[PDB]
């Protein structure tokens, strides 16, 4: 069974993509969705078997690379971590598969589409089910190619093309550091099977832990978009929304998070990497939450929410608390999926518009869609007693529980990021739903008012909600975003939970903060985010639809104008990327291939030797005037010089220099 | 509406709005293949699933009926 | 609606069929034929790799220690 949940998603995709001609659009959907659904059902069984009963299972099909000490197998290991990883991956992938049945009945190429999402599902199981780092890299690069293939799904979009390049190229930038890190693992241990790296890790050199740990830290940044390796994610949203839900909200961008958790037995023996895991997590936590506030696209705003929750995931990794990271991980996935899926039905309601400047009302038009997005946002903002409450809030107490300077320092950074989390959370809810209409008439012109004489049959299209296939995933995630947090709180968080007892997530007693997270923290700090959440929201409710003047006054001030533009344009980071990184590469290539290759390399080489040797030989041909007296004088001169060379006992260097001098005055014309 | 497109362009994934009249029996024909090699995988998986901790008989355990590493153990334990 | 699937595989129109240039018989029966037969032979080709030989010795080598309890005591 355990090897079956690897094969099925692969099998649907090849029939969908290579025989999609012979199964048709609806057949491609039925095959792949069922394959995902079947894989979903067995995944939850493995969670009940691998984790609850504490039996990890090993599959070793055959060898992949076999060179001396290096025996990498196509082998698969299920343990407590990978069954937990496979729950959000498989629940959401199925729902997104159903969500796309409604989503893309108008898109022509609909069965190339359904194969990519089932090919994405296959490689995410490969990533998490591996025995070793190298096989993980197959699911690693495999989701990266699946993402490129989906970002540029509308490949006649030039925008999708540049976005696909950015996603593909940026993830390679991290994959270099990941690959170099695995070279350090192979060098210092002789293999990279997980059982072998972690058993030996408590004895290896400290400095090899940092060098290995650092390399996988950069690799985590590219997949899990961080403060530097993120430019690929916000414009990865050029793909269809089903893609962004499964891949760019909940699954692919936590690959780096999963790597940090999986490697916890290894990285736990060097506080340095955990220190950067902490500070980088808060810096990216606040860097992202600020950006989304000033975004005039619902897809691009909710994209930036993904990075912010991702940022808090890395923070807990640096907290040496991976159980919280996994708990928050899965919990963030469920509601965040709904947030994009809720937005997706919104985009279908309007004529595929994405700007907030022409969104409003829609309360009566999209009642169900509003209800779910509120449910998701409340768990996103960590409203108390929700799915996201236990997962998102516990972090801050865990951050504050570690009574160190860094822990308290990022508590402020996380909290101010949480403050801005509220701001865009209501901004999406307000502008789209709780505000005056800002689009054209057709978005809201119902049939209750006649307003038409001969066009009563058509022209209404007043932004109705979707059908069953579009709404069913919304309802399913809605239940999880309410209750799933409380049900599994002891499963992952607990206080002395023995769920992770097969050394799946290793934690060292020297930096335990679990007891301090619940006891030593003052009560005010425990409920402080709740105070800020309920408070800072009403100011936004006060600043819009109640006053709607202070925000305009702040905009047009010279100090306020630039702060809007600076944060809108993503801290000018891509500006500093395109001009001074990639345009630099494109000009070094220009210098090399013009000045050097088709340049000096040829001139100080074939073309130069060609040009001068032709001239040198025309000159020596010039002496061949075919007149007998000139020829006799040439013979007598050579007769003289051979006598000079011999009986004078000249050093041979003069003769060489005389010849070079003659050859190179023969080179000189006239 | 429907985007116009060439009718000569053979695609392996189908083309623009591809669906054959026989999208069902062909789907059934392919569906048997997926099932056929899935249990084929399940057989090999059930034969190579190696474990080290044995489950309690009381606990719910779906794999007690197909896997080998514990079915032999369970009947071996049924000897006293 | 959903359009019937169409296209001209190999560029051969529905009226006509594909015409051979003469490479096909050598490529499918000769080139691809030989390799497939070779694939059959390889599954029978005896294992003569240094790993396999060294496994056996190293398997005996550890048997004169605690690790790898020998099936047959000496």
């Amino acid at each position: 069974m355990y090897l079956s949940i690897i094969i099925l998603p692969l099998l649907g995709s090849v029939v969908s993509g290579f025989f999609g001609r012979k199964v048709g659009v609806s057949g491609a959907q039925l095959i792949t969705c069922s394959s995902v659904i079947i894989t979903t059902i067995l995944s939850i069984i493995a969670f009940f078997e691998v984790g609850f009963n504490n039996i990890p299972v090993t599959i070793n099909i055959f060898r992949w690379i076999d060179s001396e000490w290096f025996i990498i197998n196509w082998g698969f290991q299920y343990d407590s971590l990978t069954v937990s990883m496979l729950i959000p991956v498989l629940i959401i992938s199925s729902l997104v598969h159903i969500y796309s049945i409604s989503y893309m009945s108008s898109d022509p190429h609909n069965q190339r589409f359904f194969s990519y999402l089932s090919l994405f599902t296959f490689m995410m199981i490969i990533l998490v089910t591996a025995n070793n780092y190298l096989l993980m890299f197959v699911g690693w690069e495999g989701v990266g190619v699946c993402s490129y293939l989906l970002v540029s799904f509308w490949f006649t979009r030039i925008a999708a093309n540049q976005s696909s390049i950015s996603a593909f190229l940026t993830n390679r930038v991290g994959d270099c550091f990941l690959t170099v890190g695995m070279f350090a693992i192979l060098w210092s241990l002789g293999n990279l099977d997980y059982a072998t790296v972690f058993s030996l890790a408590p004895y290896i050199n400290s400095n090899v832990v940092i060098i290995i740990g650092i390399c996988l830290l950069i690799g985590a940044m590219a997949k899990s978009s961080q403060v530097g390796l993120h430019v690929w994610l916000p414009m990865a949203m050029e793909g269809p929304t089903p893609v962004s839900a499964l891949i760019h909200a909940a699954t692919m961008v936590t690959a780096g998070v999963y790597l940090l958790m999986r490697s916890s037995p290894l990285i736990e023996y060097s506080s340095t990497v955990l220190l950067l895991c902490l500070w980088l997590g808060a810096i990216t936590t606040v860097f992202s939450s600020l950006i989304g506030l000033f975004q005039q696209d619902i897809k691009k705003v909710i994209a930036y929410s993904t990075m912010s929750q991702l940022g808090m995931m890395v923070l807990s990794i640096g907290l040496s608390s991976y159980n919280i990271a996994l708990f928050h991980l899965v919990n963030h996935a469920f509601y965040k999926a709904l947030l994009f899926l809720g937005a997706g039905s919104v985009i279908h309601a309007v004529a595929d518009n994405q700007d907030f400047r022409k969104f409003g009302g829609l309360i009566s038009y999209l009642p169900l869609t509003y209800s779910v997005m509120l449910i998701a946002s409340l768990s996103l903002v960590a409203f108390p007693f929700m799915t996201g409450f236990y997962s998102k809030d516990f972090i801050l107490e865990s951050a504050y529980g570690q009574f160190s300077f860094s822990g308290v320092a990022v508590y402020i950074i996380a909290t101010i990021g949480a403050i801005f989390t509220t701001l865009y959370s209501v901004k999406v809810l307000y502008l789209t739903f709780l505000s005056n209409p800002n689009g054209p008439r057709t978005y809201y012109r119902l049939a209750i008012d006649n307003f038409f004489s001969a066009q009563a049959i058509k022209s209404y299209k007043p932004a109705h909600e979707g059908d069953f296939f579009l709404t069913l995933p919304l309802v399913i995630l809605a239940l999880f975003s309410i209750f799933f947090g409380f049900i599994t709180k002891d499963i992952f968080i607990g206080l002395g939970s023995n769920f992770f007892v097969d050394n799946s997530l290793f934690i060292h007693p020297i930096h335990e903060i679990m007891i301090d997270t619940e006891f030593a923290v003052p009560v005010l700090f425990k409920l402080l985010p709740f105070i800020f959440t309920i408070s800072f929201s009403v100011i936004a409710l006060t600043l819009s639809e109640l006053l709607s003047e202070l925000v305009i006054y702040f905009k047009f001030s010279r100090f306020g104008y630039n702060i809007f533009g600076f944060f809108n344009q993503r801290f000018l980071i891509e500006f500093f990327y395109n001009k001074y990184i990639t345009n630099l590469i494109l000009n070094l290539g220009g210098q090399i291939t013009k000045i050097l290759d088709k340049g000096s390399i040829e001139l100080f080489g074939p073309y130069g030797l060609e040009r001068g040797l032709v001239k040198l030989s025309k000159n020596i041909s010039s002496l061949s005037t075919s007149h007998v007296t000139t020829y006799a004088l040439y013979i007598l001169v050579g007769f003289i010089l051979y006598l000079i060379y011999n009986n004078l006992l000249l050093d041979y260097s003069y003769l060489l220099l005389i010849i070079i001098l003659l050859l190179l005055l023969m080179m000189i014309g006239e | 509406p429907k985007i116009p497109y060439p009718k000569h362009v053979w695609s392996p994934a189908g083309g623009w709005y591809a669906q054959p009249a026989n999208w069902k029996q062909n789907t059934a024909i392919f569906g048997l293949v997926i099932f056929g090699i899935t249990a084929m995988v399940w057989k090999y998986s059930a034969e190579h699933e190696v474990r080290h901790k044995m489950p309690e008989p009381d606990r719910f355990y779906p794999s007690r009926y197909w896997v080998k590493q514990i079915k032999d153990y369970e009947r071996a334990q049924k000897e006293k | 609606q959903y359009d019937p699937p169409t296209g001209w595989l190999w560029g051969v129109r529905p009226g006509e069929k594909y015409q051979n240039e003469g490479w096909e018989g050598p490529f499918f029966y000769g080139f691809w034929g030989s390799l497939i037969v070779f694939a059959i032979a390889y599954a029978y080709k005896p294992d003569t790799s240094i790993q396999t030989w060294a496994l056996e010795e190293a398997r005996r080598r550890l048997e004169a220690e605690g690790i790898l309890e020998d099936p047959n005591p000496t």
């Binding site: 290579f18 025989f19 001609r21 012979k22 048709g24 | 054959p20 009249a21 026989n22 062909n26 024909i29 392919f30 293949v33 090699i37 | 019937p4 699937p5 169409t6």
Partner: peptide, 17 residues
């Protein structure tokens, strides 16, 4: 209205497996 044949490719892959 037109029908798609299983096609020689389907038999080669299934036959090969």
């Amino acid at each position: 209205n037109v029908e798609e044949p299983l096609g020689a490719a389907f038999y080669i892959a299934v036959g090969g497996i």
